[PDB]
Design a protein around this ligand. Structure first.
Ligand SMILES: CCCS(=O)(=O)Nc1cc(N)c(F)cc1F
Ligand SMILES: CCCS(=O)(=O)Nc1cc(N)c(F)cc1F
Ligand SMILES: [Mg+2]
Lengths: 150, 150
């Protein structure tokens, strides 16, 4: 269907961007809104309401640029805003070597049903936060499976 | 009116981005559609259909990124597409030392009523192409006035 074809295009764009940033160890934080509304967090960032593309996602997260610090939040198959604030988790069960990007992802996942993707600037490792847990060191296939499952 | 205020915000976003890129010698090519529709050229680029911000404009043109080569085409208060193709002018009134961004800007200005802004990556100079003419070495004040008059 058209809806299915658009979902797969968006998944492909995300995974291509994430792979590029993982290879270059570009830190990234990308939250996909689901049933719990995230308008309060969207409003803390720079409005985009942009079509998704791997190119735009990459350009957003380039280090030392206006938009790279904070979360991209996606909603209704668009990039709603960039450089958004997310609440930092206080969970004592996050790996102790991880920093604020991962704690922000876990934090939003504790109070929403969203799915957040994180790329580590230290290692290029890819992780996903959902339901208060962080799933670390994901392969490309594993991230794809999570996006399709979501 | 709201239209008038939106125009003012868009002009403020453009001038802030251009000023930042000029200071850093970040090459840029930004075409503002007016009454001649530019769909043919928009369709050659990556679709964004994004709300304008100085932050997004800057992020687009950062060197060695997916979106930085080619033109951004704006429609009113939106960035329609990035990395767009524009025709190259053969005009003999383009300074011989100038490269493809300036020739593309003059080229589109010969077949549309659009206004195109160019930042030189060699000098940081700011120029505008309109109606087949290139006006170089613009001050911040002159650029803002040209945009307001447009
Ligand atoms: C612009 C970065 C915001 S963030 O990525 O979501 N991290 C972050 C989030 C919060 N709430 C904070 F107090 C401090 C932070 F560094
Ligand atoms: C991606 C570059 C597109 S451009 O900025 O409009 N420059 C350009 C434009 C045309 N038409 C060309 F044949 C070669 C070019 F380099
Ligand atoms: Mg002069």
């Amino acid at each position: 269907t058209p809806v299915e074809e658009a979902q797969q295009k968006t998944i492909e764009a995300i995974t291509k961007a994430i792979n590029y940033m993982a290879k270059r160890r570009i830190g990234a934080l990308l939250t996909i809104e689901r049933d719990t509304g995230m308008g309060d967090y969207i409003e803390t960032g720079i409005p985009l309401n942009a079509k998704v593309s791997s190119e735009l996602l990459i350009n957003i997260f380039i280090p030392n640029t206006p938009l790279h610090d904070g979360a991209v939040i996606m909603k209704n198959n668009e990039i709603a805003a960039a450089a958004c604030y997310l609440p930092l988790s206080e969970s004592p069960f996050i790996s102790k070597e991880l920093g604020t990007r991962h704690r922000a992802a876990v934090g939003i996942s504790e109070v929403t049903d969203s799915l957040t993707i994180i790329v580590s600037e230290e290692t290029g490792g890819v992780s996903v936060a959902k339901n208060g847990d962080l799933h670390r060191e994901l392969t490309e296939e594993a991230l794809k499976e999570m996006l399709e499952a979501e």
